[PDB]
């Protein structure tokens, strides 16, 4: 009688089947592209004979149930909750399931976990045969229905100008189940209007898209205006089902396959220095089997005032040779896929979601890994007593200052590049001797990899 | 190909194969007297079948739970799986020679809206997804054109 | 300056190397799988020393040539020719050289001989060390060649349903000889369009395949719808080549081996009466060292109206113990071999080809050996003067009426089966005596092996 409507359907994500509370269930900001359903495998039996009386017969049997299909898209709207005062995306257990299979723990360091500054999602503890187990609850009008033991297969992140920032989720469940009784009241679990105002206070617009590309073999950072992009995280999950003739069967668990983090970035060719054309010609010139690039795509842009933004940080990526795409105005496409340091070392990449980004915050998130931990920005090597020169056979212990003063890693290395008339140790004691009449330089770079440069030309003379 | 869809008038689509298409110069027979006259055309057009009035009779033979399902649109076809056999001669071309009907298939797809009412679409769906059985035995009686006390055209 | 394609090959079968006419050579319609050639043997003489600085050198000698191999596939295409008005298959000399070692005589009664009703092949005259000798002529595009003194080694017939009736020929020849000049005009000898139309009017489809199997030890006919099968006519011909060390040698003569007529028949298991299951259970329950089965494989089906057909008849066959072939639908395999009554008797089996087989024609082919010779179908025995009973010490010379009225064998035998109150002679003069108060029977059967029954229950009493 009463017809169920699509627009009135609300989704609930849970980690447990009983005792649903605010810490285990949430209302998901799903769009109007929802779709789900479970199909089955069937077998037909035909008979082929040669007698005078052919047997035109066909007998059908049900054999098994395929995986339950579910897919929906949500808005990327990071925010801070009033309870914890820490930036968390509304759909945080989805990112936890995509990241690692451990118990949900925002106070840890692996998987989806927040902080006072930003919400960061790493895949360092992803090396599992089975990720975190969810339960997609589908409340269409009044009738209940949920999908048993869902697991996130992939997360489709679309980054295109003229398009608002969104993410599309698609996964599979063991068995979709319809329910008659309410598992839990949706009103108090569902987000109230105040946190809806708090969430809508932060929107991410993909029109402001700035890319950080830097090769680790040459450190040639480029300036590329983005036309449109897309990067997805794939788990390659396959459900395993038994094969029994007598009765039908349902899937039993799964085994996550190979982790894939691929992305496609479209951008216009530029003749300007460090532009798209220079990147393309450098890549098509140095044809190398292996690539090692710093790619840091920043959705929503960067600003001095706190602004909502989404960040991808791929430390050691693999850039496929670009193919310049012909159109009205030449716009090329670059394909990348983040490879790890070691196949089982994790650290494929990590993401940043928060409404409160300053350029320094995103910078230290990119270089150090967290939006809260500070990193060095500039370095000037300091002589032991404002000294400008050195004579032959004289010791000089180099000192150094770093900025900001709140940097977590402040120690720097000591090296000599230009000139051969002195030496430096781990502590910085520069030493000279006889037959040292030439000008020499001294270098200093911190171990956090900010790209900081500490330089000073000391005029080492022959002495008195 | 029988198509049963609302907003669509009842029609059937035929598709088959012949040994060899042949063009003819002489009239095999006069079309006028063989062709239907206007009176039987009036008699035929006196009866139309409209698929908008589609009522389904579904009943399982293991439980006898007849359902009340309003149809959104359907399609059922009868297939013979006919393949023509032709010889393979290198010197000259060849034409098909007879055929052997394969396996008889009578399949159909019925689209209908989910209903919370008793003996509705949702009850049928949940019963089927609850009693997962390899073999099914159902009374399906699709009635194109509807049913009425007065004489009405129906399929 | 030209390349030769396999599609332009034309094959002619001849019994003479000169004076080629339409009665000695005809074209054989071959298919893609045609193949022919001749291989050569060699030898390497290598020195095998053991010391340092050994000799490492070889040497090759051509020593012999192998027998030429040829094979091709043809369609079973019975038809009637306008010249003689007798049913004949286009590759009839192939059948003759397979069947007998005498000169071809279609008017005779052994080997390949035709009739106004059907074309027949029997192996009653194959006791020869060198069967009828052919010469395969090959015409590829423009160049000519032929194989000298061929012999039909075997003829494979595959009952592959949903396919056309086809036979595959194989054999050996003394030597393959390339001919530079045209032996005969292929335009005249090759089949013309009229006979091509007549042939293509008649095709044998393997789908319409009925099989007639009967246990001669129990008189039990089975209804087995076939799934797929094959039967072979094999001669096991081996070609002898002389060994000469100084010069290469080609085969000089041959010798036929053991004539084998085997088969293999696959079918599904049927629970119906006299089905496949009953045959399998009877065969595995008897467990007999020897079996006497009558097998009549009828390609093309049996019908009241005229239809083309190819029939293999095994009068006294030997059936192996069947096995169950576990597939999606359970089945079995009936592997048989046609054995003769006596080793030097021939008559292992025969074949009948025609484009006009009414059911009666194939029936009398099976039971009489020829499609033209009619065979008795039913019998009702008649007394002397329409008498219904008999009294003690009274004669009853019974007669017989048979159908059809044109059966070649109109005679019957006489026997008493039920009761002991009378005795019958060869002519049929039944005789009784006193003290005969029981009901006795009389039976008659034809001498052509049709399987016709003549029965009557005479109510002999003690008299008035």
From Swiss-Prot, chains A, C:
<dbReference type="Pfam" id="PF02368">
    <property type="entry name" value="Big_2"/>
</dbReference>
<keyword id="KW-0426">Late protein</keyword>
<dbReference type="InterPro" id="IPR008964">
    <property type="entry name" value="Invasin/intimin_cell_adhesion"/>
</dbReference>
<keyword id="KW-1162">Viral penetration into host cytoplasm</keyword>
<keyword id="KW-1160">Virus entry into host cell</keyword>
<feature type="region of interest" description="Disordered">
    <location>
        <begin position="40"/>
        <end position="59"/>
    </location>
</feature>
<dbReference type="GO" id="GO:0098015">
    <property type="term" value="C:virus tail"/>
</dbReference>
<dbReference type="GO" id="GO:0044659">
    <property type="term" value="P:viral release from host cell by cytolysis"/>
</dbReference>
<keyword id="KW-1243">Viral long flexible tail ejection system</keyword>
<keyword id="KW-0946">Virion</keyword>
<keyword id="KW-1228">Viral tail tube protein</keyword>
<protein>
    <recommendedName>
        <fullName>Tail tube protein pb6</fullName>
    </recommendedName>
</protein>
<dbReference type="GO" id="GO:0098026">
    <property type="term" value="C:virus tail, tube"/>
</dbReference>
<dbReference type="InterPro" id="IPR003343">
    <property type="entry name" value="Big_2"/>
</dbReference>
<keyword id="KW-1227">Viral tail protein</keyword>
<keyword id="KW-1171">Viral genome ejection through host cell envelope</keyword>
<comment type="subunit">
    <text>Homotrimer. The tail tube is made of 40 stacked trimeric rings. Interacts with baseplate tube protein p140.</text>
</comment>
<comment type="function">
    <text>Polymerizes to form the tail tube of the phage. Tail tube protein polymerization takes place around the tape measure protein (TMP-pb2) and is probably directed by chaperone proteins. The tail tube is involved in viral genome delivery during ejection.</text>
</comment>
<dbReference type="GO" id="GO:0099001">
    <property type="term" value="P:symbiont genome ejection through host cell envelope, long flexible tail mechanism"/>
</dbReference>
<feature type="domain" description="BIG2">
    <location>
        <begin position="375"/>
        <end position="453"/>
    </location>
</feature>
């Amino acid at each position: 009688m009463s017809l169920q409507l699509l627009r009135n359907t609300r989704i609930f994500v849970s980690t447990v089947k009983t005792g649903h509370n605010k810490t285990n269930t949430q209302e998901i900001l799903v769009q109007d592209d929802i779709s789900w359903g479970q199909d089955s495998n069937s077998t037909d039996i035909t008979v082929n004979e040669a007698g005078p009386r052919p047997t035109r017969g066909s007998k059908r049997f049900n054999d098994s149930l395929n995986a339950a299909e579910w897919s929906f898209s949500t808005y990327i709207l990071p925010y801070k909750d009033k309870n914890t005062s820490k930036q968390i995306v509304p759909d945080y257990m989805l990112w936890h399931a995509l990241s690692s299979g451990r118990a949900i723990n925002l106070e840890g360091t692996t998987g989806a976990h927040n902080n006072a500054t930003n919400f960061m999602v790493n895949f360092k503890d992803n090396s599992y045969h089975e990720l975190a187990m969810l339960h997609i609850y589908i409340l269409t009008d009044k009738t209940w229905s949920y999908i048993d033991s869902c697991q996130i297969n992939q997360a489709e992140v679309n980054v295109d100008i003229e398009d608002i920032g969104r993410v599309t989720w698609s996964g599979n469940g063991n068995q979709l189940i319809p329910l008659d009784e309410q598992p839990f009241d949706p009103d108090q679990i569902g987000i109230d209007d105040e946190t809806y105002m708090t969430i809508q206070g932060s929107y991410i617009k993909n029109k402001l898209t700035i890319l950080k590309i830097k090769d680790m073999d040459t450190n040639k950072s480029y300036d590329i205006p983005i036309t449109g992009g897309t990067f997805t995280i794939n788990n390659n999950i396959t459900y395993l089902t038994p094969n029994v003739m007598s009765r039908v069967t349902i899937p039993i668990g799964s085994f996550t396959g190979a982790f894939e983090l691929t992305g496609s970035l479209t951008a216009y060719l530029n003749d300007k220095s460090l532009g798209s054309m220079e990147l393309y010609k450098d890549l098509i010139k140095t044809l190398k089997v292996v690539n090692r690039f710093e790619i840091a795509l920043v959705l929503g842009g960067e600003y001095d005032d706190e602004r909502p933004a989404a960040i991808l940080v791929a430390k050691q990526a693999h850039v496929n040779i670009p193919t310049i795409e012909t159109d009205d105005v030449l716009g090329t496409s670059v394909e990348f896929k983040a490879i790890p340091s070691d196949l089982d070392a994790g650290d494929e990449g990590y993401l940043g979601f928060s409404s409160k980004y300053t350029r320094t915050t995103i910078n230290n998130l990119i270089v150090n890994g967290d939006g809260a931990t500070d990193a060095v920005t500039a370095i000037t090597v300091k002589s032991a007593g404002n000294v400008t020169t050195l004579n032959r056979s004289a010791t000089l212990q180099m000192s150094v200052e770093v900025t900001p003063s709140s940097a977590r890693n402040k120690e720097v290395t000591w090296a000599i590049t230009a000139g051969d008339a002195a030496t430096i140790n781990a502590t910085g004691l520069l030493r000279a001797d006889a037959s040292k009449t030439g000008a020499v330089t001294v270098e200093a770079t911190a171990k956090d990899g900010s790209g900081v440069k500490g330089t000073k030309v000391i005029t080492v003379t022959a002495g008195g």
